[PDB]
Amino acid sequence: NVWRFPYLCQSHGGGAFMIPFLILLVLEGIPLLYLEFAIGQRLRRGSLGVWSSIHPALKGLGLASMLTSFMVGLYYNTIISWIMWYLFNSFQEPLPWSDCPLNENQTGYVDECARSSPVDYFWYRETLNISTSISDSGSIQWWMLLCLACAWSVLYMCTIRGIETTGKAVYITSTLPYVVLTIFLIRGLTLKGATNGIVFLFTPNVTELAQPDTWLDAGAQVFFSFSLAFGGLISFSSYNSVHNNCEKDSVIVSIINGFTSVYVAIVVYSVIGFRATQRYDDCFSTNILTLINGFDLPEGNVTQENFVDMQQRCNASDPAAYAQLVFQTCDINAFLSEAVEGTGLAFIVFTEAITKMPLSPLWSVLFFIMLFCLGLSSMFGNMEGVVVPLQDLRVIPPKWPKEVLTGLICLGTFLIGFIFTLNSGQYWLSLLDSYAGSIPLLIIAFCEMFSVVYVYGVDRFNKDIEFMIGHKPNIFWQVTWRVVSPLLMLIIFLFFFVVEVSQELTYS
Amino acid sequence: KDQWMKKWWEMKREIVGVVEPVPHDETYCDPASLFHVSNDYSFIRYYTRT
Amino acid sequence: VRISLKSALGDKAYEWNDNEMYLFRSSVAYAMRQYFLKVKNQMILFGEEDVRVANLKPRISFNFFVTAPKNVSDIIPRTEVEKAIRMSRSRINDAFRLNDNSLEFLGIQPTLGPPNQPPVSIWLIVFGVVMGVIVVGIVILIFTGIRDR
Amino acid sequence: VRISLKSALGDKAYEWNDNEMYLFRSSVAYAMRQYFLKVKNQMILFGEEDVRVANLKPRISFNFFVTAPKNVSDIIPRTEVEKAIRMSRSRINDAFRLND
Ligand SMILES: *[C@@H]1O[C@H](CO)[C@@H](O[C@@H]2O[C@H](CO)[C@@H](O)[C@H](O)[C@H]2NC(C)=O)[C@H](O)[C@H]1NC(C)=O
Ligand SMILES: *[C@@H]1O[C@H](CO)[C@@H](O[C@@H]2O[C@H](CO)[C@@H](O)[C@H](O)[C@H]2NC(C)=O)[C@H](O)[C@H]1NC(C)=O
Ligand SMILES: *[C@@H]1O[C@H](CO)[C@@H](O[C@@H]2O[C@H](CO)[C@@H](O)[C@H](O)[C@H]2NC(C)=O)[C@H](O)[C@H]1NC(C)=O
Ligand SMILES: *[C@@H]1O[C@H](CO)[C@@H](O)[C@H](O)[C@H]1NC(C)=O
Ligand SMILES: *[C@@H]1O[C@H](CO)[C@@H](O)[C@H](O)[C@H]1NC(C)=O
Ligand SMILES: *[C@@H]1O[C@H](CO)[C@@H](O)[C@H](O)[C@H]1NC(C)=O
Ligand SMILES: *[C@@H]1O[C@H](CO)[C@@H](O)[C@H](O)[C@H]1NC(C)=O
Ligand code: MET
């Protein structure tokens, strides 16, 4: 909601990714979620023992879910690694990414720190040390092995025993972001460039939501904002007592997340707009300066409103001296839709607008602890969803404790996680992110949404939930389970298949 | 009366083709150091006669 | 020279009349006097009438050059005036409350200042303390279990 | 006048040679020029040779007085020099990095 949402919004303009997202939310995020909660409570087993009881040839879902929850967690942890690497570089009064370092010959800045921002020569050359091409990979970059080890150690120190040890970490690290986020919202809306970005978010380019790309992106994002088809919520809803009102919880969670999805878009665009209007004022000041340095006008006569007339008032006085100055061009609504991509949206925008506020060595630490304790929970759930189906497969002799299996999984994934710490490291991450977040999620979701209502019978499930909570579900759940949900899925599927051919595969 | 020397040296450069070797602010009067302008004599008679 | 008063002072910006030109010429004479005493060990009495000024403009710019005390045909070469100014720039700035970007000298650009902040690479000790707390948590929580069994 | 360099600057305290006396006399001439233009609306060209200085000492103290531009027998009364200095004190301080 902070790292993939605004990018997938900006690439599609910014206004065409809020109407489709919400329609797909209200139409698919809620019913499938309620379905999977209800099953997790009825069948009384984990994420694999369920799909192995319904027509036992359907045990594949118990393996596709495990494999995909592993492939996601493979890099959703190195992102946490980068975040805590940034968090370590705070605790110093002059922020490291606020100045360019000088070369061996102390006369000017290093080349690439001068031709670009001072904050891009901390993410692209000091943190990652990116090489020119994906086919070119070099050393191991120890100073990110340190952060990888620290991340995979914090995680294993928090989930040592499944439940009874995620309890307290959930008490702490699932309420902290909901106050730091408000603290940042209050600071964001009172900035200089607010109300110029959050109004850009809500203007729909009507001829953009008529392309299959935006629909496919909304479809693949509404299943990733939740954790449907990951196999994590089945297991969590397979513990509590039987006569529990499975509905209420479902609905409230569905409406507590889809609300915090437009409550983070507001805070992020309230900073993107600020940065854009700042760069715009800088371009305009540079133009004014290039004019007066060239014609010797007083200081306060060329201001932001009488500029065009004053520029016409010189060309008619020194025509040979005027046609030499190289003017810039800069208009708003062109600085907003700029080159902003994931892995570089929460590290290139928020880290340069965090150093232009008083007492920055506090706002930076608060923001990055928010991001860390916002991303840790997710990994809690994912590690539960990968550990549960393993010991339900009799892969380890049952006489061994649970700590040994959690430790083995952590060590294995850490040792595989050396692929993202090379020089050419950000490209591998971009690739895996794109494809493993896009394609398998929606096919698993459709397969389970079909299996539950057409292999288990919908009427059996109906009277089952009736006995559980105490009332048949309203007509809404019926219509959205029987026809609309699978039909929507098919559409998303074909759109993905029509958005893969005829679109070139390029990276930056 | 605060552009006397400015105009004197602008005209000198533009139409005579002669530049001053040291800049002269408004505390000078370079034309008044001529016999004819400090003693109140008309000067056009030297043009037309020629 | 090019001077920008509204940028630096913003408000409280005094007005640039002729007495400011007097003060500027005196500051340049002082800088020259300082340079020909701490480098070349002469003792030359530059005055504010040895600093000639040309092309005054509203933007608050102009040109100047310096001559030996009583010899109008003796121009100090430009590569020495540049060094004298490099040497006394910080006092010439202070006399006017300008700050080295509102008092540019057009061919003399500033560089003074070393960027040698970090003695310790502070992120290392923060990583050390977090590693210590995480390892101590790991052992205490894996020993809680063996105690409870 | 009494000047204390080691107190204010502490370190980095420049040395008070004769060029500093030149700069001080120029600052006082500027202050006088300012006062006889923003109060009395004259235009008088005080120079640094109109500021006479007596009794220099190591403590960095001395006396001074001001005379009209080319008239050695025309001393500006002290109650006007005091007002001109009251008016331009903050710039005279800045030229030297002293702090009142
Ligand atoms: C609104 O969306 C439309 C797409 O429907 C954009 O139109 C495209 O603009 C790009 C500009 O780089 C062209 O290369 C495409 O050929 C255009 N496609 C069509 C179908 O016109 C339009 O640019 C968007 N609005 C703005 C302001 O950019
Ligand atoms: C004024 O300066 C000029 C040069 O700037 C001095 O001229 C020099 O005079 C000596 C002897 O007359 C010659 O050998 C040099 O060649 C001259 N210099 C140049 C550049 O031609 C002149 O001496 C100075 N005035 C006084 C009084 O010393
Ligand atoms: C120099 O200053 C003195 C006073 O400081 C001026 O003397 C005055 O002269 C006029 C006419 O000569 C007398 O009426 C005044 O009484 C004089 N003043 C005093 C205090 O006696 C003198 O005029 C000034 N010099 C010039 C050239 O004007
Ligand atoms: C800096 O100076 C050294 C020695 O003077 C020189 O070898 C080096 O090339 C200079 N730096 C650059 C970028 O040229
Ligand atoms: C960054 O990578 C380059 C390879 O292009 C390598 O030469 C350099 O040593 C790396 N940076 C550091 C600080 O080692
Ligand atoms: C700026 O200067 C021009 C010419 O001196 C003048 O016409 C104009 O009015 C000035 N600006 C303002 C705001 O008065
Ligand atoms: C300046 O004026 C000339 C006419 O003298 C015209 O040809 C030219 O296009 C003008 N330039 C601009 C930028 O308006
Ligand atoms: C292992 S799930 C990764 C993150 C989490 N599922 C989310 O949607 O935020």
Numbering used by the authors:
A (entry chain B): 54 to 561
B (entry chain A): 470 to 519
C (entry chain A): 620 to 768
D (entry chain C): 620 to 719
Excerpt from the publication:
B0AT1 (SLC6A19) and SIT1 (SLC6A20) are special members of the SLC6 family that rely on the ancillary protein Angiotensin-converting enzyme 2 (ACE2) or Collectrin for their membrane trafficking. ACE2 functions as a peptidase that regulates the maturation of angiotensin (Ang) and serves as the critical host receptor for SARS-CoV-2, while Collectrin is a homolog of ACE2 with a similar tissue distribution, including the liver and kidneys. B0AT1 is responsible for the uptake of neutral amino acids such as glutamine (Gln), leucine (Leu), and methionine (Met). On the other hand, SIT1 primarily facilitates the transport of imino acids such as proline (Pro) and pipecolate.
The local resolution of the transmembrane domain of ACE2-B0AT1 complex in complex with Gln, Met, or ACE2-SIT1 in complex with Pro are 3.6 Å, 3.9 Å, or 3.7 Å, respectively. The binding pattern of amino acid substrates differs among the ACE2-B0AT1+Gln, ACE2-B0AT1+Met, ACE2-B0AT1+Leu, and ACE2-SIT1+Pro complexes, despite all binding to the unwound region of TM1 and TM6. In the B0AT1 complex, Met binds in a classical mode, establishing five hydrogen bonds with the carbonyl oxygen atoms of Val50 in TM1, carbonyl oxygen atoms of Phe277 and Phe279 in TM6, the side chain of Ser278, and the side chain of Tyr129 in TM3. The hydrophobic side chain of the Met substrate is surrounded by a cluster of hydrophobic residues, including Phe48, Val125 and Phe283. The binding mode of Leu substrate is more similar to that of Met. Upon substrate binding, dramatic conformational changes occur in the ACE2-B0AT1+Met complex compared to the apo ACE2-B0AT1 complex. Specifically, the hydrogen bonds between Arg57 and Tyr129 in apo ACE2-B0AT1 complex are disrupted once the substrate Met binding and the guanidinium group of Arg57 is oriented towards the benzene group of Phe277, forming a cation-π interaction, which triggers the rotation of TM1b by ~5 Å towards the extracellular end and thus causes the shift of the C-terminal end of the EL7-8 and EL5-6.
